[PDB]
Amino acid sequence: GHYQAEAALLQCTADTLADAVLITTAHAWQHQGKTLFISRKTYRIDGSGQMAITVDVEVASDTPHPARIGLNCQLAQVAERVNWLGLGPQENYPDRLTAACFDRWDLPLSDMYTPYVFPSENGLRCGTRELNYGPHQWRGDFQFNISRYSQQQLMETSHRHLLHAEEGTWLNIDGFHMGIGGDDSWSPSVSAEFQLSAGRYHYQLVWCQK
Amino acid sequence: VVLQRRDWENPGVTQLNRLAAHPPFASWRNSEEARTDRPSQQLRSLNGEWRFAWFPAPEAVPESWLECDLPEADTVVVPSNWQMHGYDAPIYTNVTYPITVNPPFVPTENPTGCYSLTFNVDESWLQEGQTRIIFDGVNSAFHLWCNGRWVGYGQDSRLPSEFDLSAFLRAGENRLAVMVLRWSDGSYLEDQDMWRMSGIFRDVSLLHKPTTQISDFHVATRFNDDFSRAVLEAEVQMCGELRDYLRVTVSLWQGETQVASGTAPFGGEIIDERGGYADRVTLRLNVENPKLWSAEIPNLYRAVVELHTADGTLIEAEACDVGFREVRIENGLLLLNGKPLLIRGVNRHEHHPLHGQVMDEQTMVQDILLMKQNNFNAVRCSHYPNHPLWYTLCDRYGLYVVDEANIETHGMVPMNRLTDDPRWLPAMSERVTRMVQRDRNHPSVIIWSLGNESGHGANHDALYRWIKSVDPSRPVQYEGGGADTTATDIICPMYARVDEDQPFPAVPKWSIKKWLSLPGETRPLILCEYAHAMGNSLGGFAKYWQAFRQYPRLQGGFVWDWVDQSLIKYDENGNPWSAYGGDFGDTPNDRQFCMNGLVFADRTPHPALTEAKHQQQFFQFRLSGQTIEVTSEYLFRHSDNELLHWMVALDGKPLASGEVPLDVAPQGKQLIELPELPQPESAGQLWLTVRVVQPNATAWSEAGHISAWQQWRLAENLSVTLPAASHAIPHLTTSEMDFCIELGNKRWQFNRQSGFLSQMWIGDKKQLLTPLRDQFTRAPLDNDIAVSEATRIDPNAWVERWKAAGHYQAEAALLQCTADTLADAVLITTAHAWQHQGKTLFISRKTYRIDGSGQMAITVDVEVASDTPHPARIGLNCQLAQVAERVNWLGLGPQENYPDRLTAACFDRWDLPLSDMYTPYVFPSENGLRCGTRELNYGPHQWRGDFQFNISRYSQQQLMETSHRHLLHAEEGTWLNIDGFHMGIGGDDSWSPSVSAEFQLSAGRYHYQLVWCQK
Ligand SMILES: OC[C@H]1O[C@@H](OC[C@H]2O[C@@H](O)[C@H](O)[C@@H](O)[C@@H]2O)[C@H](O)[C@@H](O)[C@H]1O
Ligand SMILES: [Mg+2]
Ligand SMILES: [Mg+2]
Ligand SMILES: [Mg+2]
Ligand SMILES: [Mg+2]
């Protein structure tokens, strides 16, 4: 029920600090009485404008290891370029990133999408410390993809020519992402060291304006 | 003549007047005594009280000593090593010879032990037949006199020397004089990494044989394809006068049943143009469906060899235990009785902490029992022939033995300088040939070894072929010169790693997996030494066993090694302490490098032993849904003394348990279907534990012995239900120097100059003696230190890199220390930089969140500079004020376990006395860690999370500064180390970096979280 599971709110509080506002949240994703994931976050917005998001996730040991642990949202902005400090310039995944180099990369938005004829998750870049898109900057240690196509649209479409640019830009920022495998394509082929099996996961992001 | 000839400085003379080697004799004059292995009146022990005098050199020995007792002499127990009686110091050196390397010469100051014995010989022993003396072990060379007359000379410390005394003895009182030299040319071949001692250290006895005697006999057993038929072949040799009326009978016995018998006159088959051996005969006995010998089932028969007259008068009888088994290498696999062995082996020196190198039955039995109880099936005689009883016990209890010649020339440059020299071939040959002649009839001996660490010389090739020629029944192995030379049937490296190559010039150690498939290579690989168990070690052990099980031609190895070579010394109050190299004034020395055991010298187990037991299990398990699949790794036995106990628990709380009898054929599988398990009410992780129990006692184990276990995680139910909001609210008191938080009779004090929780108060009672600080270092393990020779330092060793980077000197510098008030909590935020000489090694960012329930939530985020050596640990430490009796935890245990040595540990609720949370390694280091812990309880304290911890009365600082365990003092309160992360311990070897990459703290950024509350 990973594709069906809905977020249920456990906690949502706000506190005023010396030079910041702190929002604290907790969610559970459940499928037929079973808790698959728990997400606990703090958002800390300070006087400089930077929003620090600290995320701690629990994944039930007996549920299949998840494909990714991250956040997504649809930005209103459509910008021409994507600028990042991390692995590139081309698409790279945890078990396929040796070719990629760490550096400052700047590509048009369209290069951040790989037009596989059968559409799927694509265009990820790993080992990223800084991502820039229009006025937005994200900092941390994350994997990301960015495009005009949502994960849902990619999931529901069988041919690349039937894809349509959605309003704004879909951003997926992951703290962790499963390997892609490929020893073969007709059995589970992702190696254990690339499966998200740790049980507890932590990542932090800083979101600010350029 | 004796002084003039200096036979102890001539590798061309290794003996004078010594009798031929042979299998164990007792010269029974009663066949029934021979059958039942009862004592023999013809074999008398001379052990007990002898007289002894120490001299600095053989030139210092007064001539009168030959004729009568020195009044200056003392009375001492024999067998003994004279260093153990305090006459001079034992020397611990590893590679470097304890004498100047100048073959064949030894120092002129050559410690000389003068032993003598006045004893009675009855006339009946001298009127007829032959009286010989037997010295089973004399280190390192000796001259023998009897009633003042020179008898002979012997070398090789590890095999018996025998001399005919018939013409030297008189009726009544006789006197033996034995002049034992510490050093001789034989010492050049005796450079084993062990204490250098000397003396008459094995049994001394007298044996009476008739003039017409059995002088030798060899037992072979050959089989048909399915081992349903066997032929026992016994070759027998005689000395004395040949007569037509002489006969030999060989009988085979199964318990009290005679299964076969053969009789013949002397006279062998024609072997060449000059005829045959008139003084030998070969009897052949057919055996149908023999019971086969193995370590699994050590079935033994008894062979009795009788020399007699045609009309039935017995002259004498000899006998041995016979094990029907075949050892062969076929298609690259070592087979026993047609099945591929998986060698669960260990190297074992003959060592006792009180008695030195003197071995006794009790110590031997204790070692064998502990080995078998810990799933070992094989032992390597590192590096010399053992005390004869050892083989008899291995025959009877069931262990595979590698019998090894007493040859090690490690200290030579290059290592084969002597072994490639034809001048040293005679001396080397006697150490090989006399071992074979003695031990060839033992079923436990399955492999011959040419010695240890003597490079590869032409002499090895010659002696390899000699053994292959005289004994085709056993493979020959030898490691020197790169582990895969033409002098070895088995690729037998030492400390070759599983996946990692070590490409040393000329003698590389390939990954064992890679080694097998090198172009042209076809042999099986069995490590003669692996998993160096020095101190806190055996990291990565499971990696070897995973590989052994996956690759057919990887057939195991022998752990180095069984028992720590520590010796007992006494303090001023007579209290004993464990000593090592250098503690006896011995110099130069190699310090603690003599201690590499799975067990302490007194046979108390190190934590590593349990890891060995678990990985060497004979049953394998898989879980699929409700089904447990049990696979047998036995080759011969059905599981006829085994039952499976299963237990399902929820965070340590038993929910269901049952038992099923195991009925598994060798190599077979059994499926056990678990019953419907009731859903647990509470949240948490369900764990399945299975264990294999032996309901019945055996020769080697008690009833209820656990032989195997395994755990799996089952269903987990994550906690979604929030704690009911506590009504109380903590109060922050700010001052210039401190942030104080109060909640009832509870205070938390954070120093604002340092940025650490410097104190906690429960009422008016202090909880901390030292502030809670970050710790990134450990008191270095033997593996960390990585020294095999005290002189040499490896700049790549972990301790060296840590020291050079300033990890042990690093000073915390405060970056940020702030306090905030939330609706229902106080939030303290800190950041520290650890720096050495301008360079930042680590940054620690923390939050402490204290709520109304009195729980302190600590979040820690650490950055580690990518160019600093990976740190030993990422954690916190403090000295608690409390000293409590018990430590209680939910996590891996009960024993000490580390990230790369935790497979044996089980997740459960464990409760131990505080003292059991400290492992008393003789050389102190980081110790007592327990991993995968979710909850820890000590006195009033509780910590929750996912962490590793150790807890004890010794700081890392004291452990780092103290060279011997007995010098450690309990500190005030209790030192707690709680780690989010801890580096592997390594152990593949202990003289270079050995911690595998997946166990090094290389991630750059680390996060862990702890909750500290009062229980
Ligand atoms: O305790 C070590 C153990 O291992 C074997 O080899 C010893 C070791 O000594 C070091 O000085 C050398 O650098 C290294 O080449 C060698 O492996 C030996 O067979 C054992 O008897 C014992 O010393
Ligand atoms: Mg690369
Ligand atoms: Mg000599
Ligand atoms: Mg050596
Ligand atoms: Mg006895």
Ligand code: NA
């Ligand atoms: Na699709």
Ligand code: NA
């Ligand atoms: Na194997």
Ligand code: NA
């Ligand atoms: Na050693």
Ligand code: NA
């Ligand atoms: Na059974």
Ligand code: NA
């Ligand atoms: Na120490």
